[PDB]
Amino acid sequence: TGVAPPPPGWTPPDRTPRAITVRRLIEAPYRELAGVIDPANLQLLDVSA
Amino acid sequence: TGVAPPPPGWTPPDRTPRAITVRRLIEAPYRELAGVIDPANLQLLDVSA
């Protein structure tokens, strides 16, 4: 025959999870602990926490 | 013609949010704070809170 069938099917999504390339680790300063931890528990926190 | 078509369609619900007419503001007494706040944080609360 002359005609040919082209690819178009469903084109499944390519989820295939990849590893994260951009990232970072940090230490939480007192600013967040002040606003996310209640005073009663915060005051008992030692300086080395 | 003689016959006429009456309204009945779907009668869409009238959601159309309105403003609240009845309301009030209050100050929470110690009764609720006692039962909703743990003792450790409550005891540190000043008298002016």
Torsion of CA B3, B7, B9, B12, to 10 degrees: 180
Lookup: tokens for A17: 């999870």
Lookup: tokens for B9: 């369609």
Torsion of CA B5, B10, B13, B16, to 10 degrees: -70
Q: In chain B, what is the straight-line distance between the N-terminal and C-terminal CA atoms, in Å? A: 77
Rounded distance between C-alpha atoms, residue A31 and residue A33, angstroms: 6
Single-letter amino acid code for the residue at B46: D
Angle at B37 between CA B34 and CA B41, to 5 degrees: 110
Rounded distance between C-alpha atoms, residue B20 and residue B14, angstroms: 16
CA distance B34 to chain A (A): 15
Elucidation technique: cryo-EM
CB contact under 8 A, A41 and B40: yes
Torsion of CA A27, A28, A29, A30, to 10 degrees: -140
**Centroid of chain to Cα A49:** 25
Other CB atoms within 10 A of residue B42 CB: 14
> Which residues on B lie below 8 Å from A38 (Cβ)?
38, 40-41
